[PDB]
Amino acid sequence: TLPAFGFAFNASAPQFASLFTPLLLPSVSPNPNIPVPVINDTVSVGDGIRILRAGIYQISYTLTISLDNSPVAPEAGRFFLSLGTPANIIPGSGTAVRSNVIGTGEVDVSSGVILINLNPGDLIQIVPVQLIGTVDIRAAALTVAQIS
Amino acid sequence: LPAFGFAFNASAPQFASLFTPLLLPSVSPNPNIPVPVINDTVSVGDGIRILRAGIYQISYTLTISLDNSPVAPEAGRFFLSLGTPANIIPGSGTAVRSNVIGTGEVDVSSGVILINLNPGDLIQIVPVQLIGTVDIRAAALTVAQIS
């Protein structure tokens, strides 16, 4: 009837990125007056959203990244959405951010609005696939919405 | 027909001010056939008011210059707000920060925020923390019903 969707976000604690480890996304209720899980025929598992309904989806993410975590190594990261397992990354969902100097403050990342065929049991997660030094994820959010 | 609204500023930069909704005067992006891309919402000049209960995707983009200033650092945090500028929406937050002067334009996009909204809910882009001078070269707000 209504399209399937899910929204999971982290606005409660920064997290350090860890190679191929899905990002923690504990919250599903963004409305500050009337919070309610914005979840329909999906499942938020704590570090991702599981598909329950076959179809075409828009999936996307946002990250806030601080690159000031080292005194000697300029920091960088490459991020993707993964399908099923962290290694099974989705081409077209990739982003990158890299600083050649130490002490770089927050920068913003957003993926494209990725349109993709998904199937029941598909677990969509945000994964770092390459990290240069320590990367501080100040906040993150993952969006799943059925188009067809 | 789903409810939707798109409001943007491509005509004039604006300096971010604390808890002051960004100015978004335009609703017509099509350069060939300029019509207001507004259905069952209202653009009020600095935001979009919801008229129809439902589930929505709301999002924003900011083009921010960080070198329009003689003092450092240059930094801002931005949220979508609900009803009043202080009533910020968790999950809609972004931040940029340069510890030194001389950083040009940077890009910000929020997530595609899915959220239950209700008639009369006013959605705006608000700065919530500002250091130095933060120059919003361009901004756009998007509201579209999931249905």
Binding site: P14, E106, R138 | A72, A75, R77, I88, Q129
Partner: peptide, 20 residues
Amino acid sequence: IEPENIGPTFSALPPIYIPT
């Protein structure tokens, strides 16, 4: 909601200065 503890927050924040 008070914004100070809603992520993302700045991980550090220098005091205002004129670079020299």
